[PDB]
Copies of this chain bind each other. A is one copy, B any other.
Amino acid sequence: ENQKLIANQFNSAIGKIQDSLSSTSSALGKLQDVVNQNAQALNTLVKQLSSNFGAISSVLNDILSRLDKVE
């Protein structure tokens, strides 16, 4: 009787720990997906910002150049 109680409680605990492990795996997978998406987003932003400040630098250089030509 006590053995059946120990076995039932252990099976219940193993079921609950399986649920907890599945929940932890799902949470870690979602966090991985989101962190990787934000990493790709920051990298894309950094790249396109590099390009955009490059364009701004070029146009400001042309402005300053003809500018200088003016006076």
Nearest residue in B to A39 (C-beta to C-beta)? B38
Q: How many copies of this kind of chain does the complex include?
A: 3
Complex Cα distance, B13 from A7, in Å, reads 13
Nearest residue in B to A68 (C-beta to C-beta)? B66
Query: Which listed residue (B21, B31, B67) contacts A20, Cβ 8 A?
Result: B21
Complex Cα distance, B59 from A53, in Å, reads 14
Given A32-B31, A60-B59, A63-B63: A6 touches B10 (CB 8 Å cut-off): yes
Q: Told that A6-B10, A9-B10, A27-B28 touch, could you supply 15 new A-B pairs with CB distance under 8 A?
A: A3-B3, A6-B6, A13-B17, A20-B21, A34-B35, A38-B42, A42-B45, A49-B49, A52-B53, A59-B64, A60-B63, A63-B63, A66-B71, A70-B70, A70-B71
